[PDB]
Every structure is written in C-alpha cells, then in structure tokens.
Symmetry: D2
Subunit: 116 residues, 4 copies
Amino acid sequence: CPLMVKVLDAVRGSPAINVAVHVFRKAADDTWEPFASGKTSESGELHGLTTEEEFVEGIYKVEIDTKSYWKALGISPFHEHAEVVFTANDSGPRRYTIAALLSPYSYSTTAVVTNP
Amino acid sequence: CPLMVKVLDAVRGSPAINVAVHVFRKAADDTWEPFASGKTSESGELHGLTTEEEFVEGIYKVEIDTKSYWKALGISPFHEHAEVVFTANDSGPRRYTIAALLSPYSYSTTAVVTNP
Amino acid sequence: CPLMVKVLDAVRGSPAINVAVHVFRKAADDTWEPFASGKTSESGELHGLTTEEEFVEGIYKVEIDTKSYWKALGISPFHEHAEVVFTANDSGPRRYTIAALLSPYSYSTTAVVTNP
Amino acid sequence: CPLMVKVLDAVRGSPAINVAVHVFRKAADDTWEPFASGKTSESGELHGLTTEEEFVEGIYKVEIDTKSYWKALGISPFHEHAEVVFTANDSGPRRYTIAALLSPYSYSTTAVVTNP
Ligand SMILES: O=C(c1ccc(O)cc1O)c1ccc(O)cc1O
Ligand SMILES: O=C(c1ccc(O)cc1O)c1ccc(O)cc1O
Ligand code: NA
Ligand code: NA
C-alpha cells in the first residue's frame, strides 16, 4: 500500500464513513487524469488505491467529496470538496498516508510519509 | 472587503508574508477562469482582491501557493499548494475570509462568512 | 496589546462569540495563580487582558472555556476546555496572539509572536 | 484498549516518536492524580495505558511533552506541552483515541470515539 487516505469527522468525533475519494495524476498536457478512486470504510480509511508499480513519481491530486458527506448528515457545508495536491518523490520514504480532519467550514490535512 | 485571505506560519509563529494567492471562478464551460490574484502583506493578509460588483454568484477556487513560500524560505514541503473551493454569494452577497495555517507537511483552512 | 486571544467556530464559519477565557501564571510555589480573564467579543477577539508592565516573564496558561461555549449553543462537546501553556517574555517583551479554531470533538491552536 | 494516544509531526510528515505522554484523572479534591504514562512508539502511538476495568467515568487530562520533542530535533517551540482535558462517558462509544498533530507554534487535537 504505497497510498492510503484517512478521513475523520471533527463534529461527531468519528471516522468519516462512505466518503467518496478520487485520485488524479497530472498528465504531460497539464490536465488531471483519473488514477484511482473509492469510498472510505467504516474506519474512515481507503486502502488498495494503487500498487508500487503504478505509483510513479509525479504530481497527484486527492479529491475528497466533503460536501456530499455533510449533506447526508443534514449539515450545510462551506467547501465543494477538499483537495490535496502533492508530488510523489522516490528519494523520500515509501508509503504515503493522506489524512484529513473535516468540519463544516474547515478542514485540516497532513501527510504521513514513512518507510516500511 | 468581500473576499479576504489570511495566512499564518505554524513553524515560525508569525504571519506568512509574501504568499502568492490566485483566485479562479468556474465558467459556463466548466473550466477555471482567472478571477483575481495578489500576495499577502507583512500581516499575512491579502485585501483588495475583488469588489462587490465583480464578486457575483459562482464556484470559486482560492489557490494559496504554499510550496513557493516554503521553498523561498529554503525548505522542501509536501504540498504543491492549498486549494479552497466553495460556492459564494448564492443567497446574496456575503463577506468571506479564507484563513490558512501552514506547516511543511500539513495545513488547515477555515472560512469566516458574514452578512453585511 | 501584549496578549490577545482570538477564537473561531469551524461549524458555523463565524467568530466564536462570548467565549470565556481565563489566564493563569505559575507562581514561585508551582501553583497556577489567576492572572486575567475576559470573554470574546462579537469579532471573536479578547483584548485588554493585561498591560506591558503586568505581563512579566513567566509560564502562562490560557484556558479557553470551549465546553461552556458548545453547551450554551445546545451541543455536547468532547473537551472540557482548551489549554495553551507557554513561557512568555523570557527574551524581553513580546506581543502574543493565541488563536483557536473550535469544533465539538477537535480544536486547533496557534501562536503569533511579534517583537515591538 | 479503551484509551490510545496518537501523535504526528506536521513539520517532517512523520509519526512523533518517543514523545512522553502522561495521563491524569481528576480526584474528588479537584487535584490531578497520575493515572498512566508512556512514550510513543515508532508509529507515534501509545497503547496499553489502561484497562476497561480501570477507565471509569471521570475527567481525564492527557499531557503530551511537546517541548522536549522539539528540543531534541533542535527546534525552539512555543508550548510547554499540549494538554487534552475531557470527560469519559459510558453512554458514548467505548474506545477513545486522542490524536495530536504537532508544529513548533501550533497543535491540533481531535478525539475519535468508536464502538468495538
Ligand atoms: O486527527 C487527526 C488524525 C490523524 C491520523 C490519525 O491516525 C488519527 C487522527 O485523529 C488529524 C488528521 C489530519 C489533520 O490535518 C489533523 C489531524 O489532527
Ligand atoms: O485559530 C485560527 C485563527 C487564525 C486567524 C485568526 O485571526 C483567528 C483564528 O482563530 C485558525 C484559523 C485557520 C486555521 O486553519 C486554523 C486555525 O487555528
Ligand atoms: Na440563490
Ligand atoms: Na532571559
């Protein structure tokens, strides 16, 4: 698992379950091409997005559909989505965790990059 | 000010000065049209991006150029930028403050929305 | 202002108004002595806590009464309060802003420290 | 494991390893009594603090020694420590995760409370 996404809910103090997540890779013509996607599990996590072979150096975008998440809870949110844009670099540690902590008008995101 | 951006640096405990900010608005053909840009002052604030007349209903993207900020300070950060995407003024004119708190591998953003 | 506190609400996208704040200073016997208190204004800010003369070197604790804020809004939050503990003025007088961003099960705090 | 603590480093994008953590329980005389302690592991986590039998309803304080962590990295930080104060309540879900994301002048904390 070179890439994992984890999403938490700061209002309820829980994992954010069944949140849609889309990953894109920047193409040579500077457009975003679909790369991988899924929905967070009951632990707020999305595993199995890619493989080491497929996850080469490049610029990636992780788009978390926060608006649908809040609307399903009956809460009007601010953002259309949360976007996390970063470069994957081989010199750095192997495994990337992209974490996001969600509130209706705010989000935090951090990267935990470690060596297996 | 209908739209203001404020940026803080969590490493130095200071405003984030001379941070470039680009604002885009989604056009009728679904592309991101350049809308306004500027850079943060010594107080970490960016005022004067737009006017009440210009700042119509729409979907807006505020791109904060965090990578260039950390690199101009001689540090190699994780993200390319921080993006904040939101619908504005769809219930009439509001004042928006987009605030961000930056670290090299993490950022937080929140919105303060007031009715004049 | 040698010491200012600013508080935002991540659920409502607004300043956090009428939040009680208590400041303490560690005494020579290691106990926490009451130092100053107040509540945030309509802008979410609390000014006038202390003076340059009064705000000597020491270890200070700023207690932000988040539970009472969420409960006065009719919500049951996780934390009792948010505490911010720091040494101040040990290299001479500085200006301190303690900022906090609140959600029912989470909060963020940062400091902006400037030299007059 | 009714109580787990997880600590992340927002500057390096890594778990915060070997961070001292102390847990206290509020006594009837309103003083803080030591309850459990340890150091975070190579994953930034501290497990095994308490048992279901021992972790009764009450007010608890988790104190994370952030100052020593930053000093060991050669970084001058702002806070003496990060403190998280909360009530344990049986009506709510069983397992508490207290997470903290650290920067030199800022920290975020959230609670993830779930049902096994
Ligand atoms: O609360 C967070 C968290 C992160 C990882 C984890 O295993 C558990 C967490 O609660 C968290 C995530 C992203 C962020 O930007 C800030 C956070 O406190
Ligand atoms: O606490 C914050 C804050 C920042 C600027 C300000 O004028 C007031 C604040 O409470 C804050 C704002 C945005 C964010 O992503 C994280 C924060 O702690
Ligand atoms: Na409308
Ligand atoms: Na001194």
